[PDB]
Amino acid sequence: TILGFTYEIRLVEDGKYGAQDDVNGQWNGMVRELIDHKADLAVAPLAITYVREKVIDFSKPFMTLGISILYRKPNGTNPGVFSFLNPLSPDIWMYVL
């Protein structure tokens, strides 16, 4: 609606957002897309990393991000009689009885 283009959306087969090779120095996916101008744009959530920004141009950001720790809530602790009489053995309890 802003720029007025006939946008075409299709899929890639490279399977990665873009990563330089460790010994070859070769990228893949969106980075080699925008080096060779195979497609004009790649609308994907991509962080503004300076290694990618020194290769291809990057736009100004529209939303923030952050690496966060993912975990669960493994909480039990059933409030019962057995939890109340926990720190002594029941054989000791019946021997005292």
Binding site: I69, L70, Y71, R72
Partner: protein, 194 residues
């Protein structure tokens, strides 16, 4: 009768030392339960090598750890270098199931974690933000669209449409186990003679 005195003194003695030993055992158990810190933040998992942690394999997360200089993040980097074939997964859902099944921590996008915790009650977000970056749209070098893309992103940010669109789219414990036993003791105290 000195026999009754001896029996009462011995009975008070062993009842008091059983009560003291039970109090000491419960104090040690509660102190261990308090000392067991359940917080597993960035400073906690720097040295906790028992709990596995990592990220999606060859993503932007350890790319930030490729150039990290903080010794906690260097510890994370050395741990994922030591166990590269195990704790690294190709997709997000593999790490999600690794967190749900095994003792695993996963380091990925906070908005995705927020959406997953919105749609699943079985997961939590702990700690804060390790980094602080933004989403930049991928453009070729020297792109004439990219200037117009930057102007359009500024216009949509000043309009606030992206923020409200992101708002709509992809957003007694142990003391409680005490008074039940006391109520049962009250029930047994009622059923004596009345």
């Amino acid at each position: 009768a000195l026999s009754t005195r001896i029996v009462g003194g011995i009975w008070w003695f062993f009842t008091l030392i059983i009560i003291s030993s039970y109090t000491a055992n419960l104090a040690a158990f509660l102190t261990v339960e308090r000392m067991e810190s359940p917080i597993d933040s960035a400073d906690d998992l720097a040295k906790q090598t028992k709990i596995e942690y990592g990220a999606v394999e060859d993503g932007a997360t350890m790319t930030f750890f490729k150039k990290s200089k903080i010794s906690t993040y260097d510890k994370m980097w050395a741990f994922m270098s030591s166990r590269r074939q195990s704790v690294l997964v190709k997709s997000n859902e593999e790490g999600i199931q690794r967190v749900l099944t095994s003792d695993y921590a996963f380091l990925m996008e906070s908005t995705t974690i927020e959406f997953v915790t919105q749609r699943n009650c079985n997961l939590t977000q702990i700690g804060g933000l390790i980094d602080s970056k933004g989403y930049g749209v991928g453009t070729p070098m020297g792109s004439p669209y990219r200037d117009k893309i930057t102007i359009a992103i500024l216009q949509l940010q000043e309009e606030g449409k992206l923020h409200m669109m992101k708002e709509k789219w992809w957003r007694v414990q142990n003391i409680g186990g005490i008074f039940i036993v006391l109520a049962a003791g009250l029930v047994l105290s009622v059923f004596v003679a009345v």
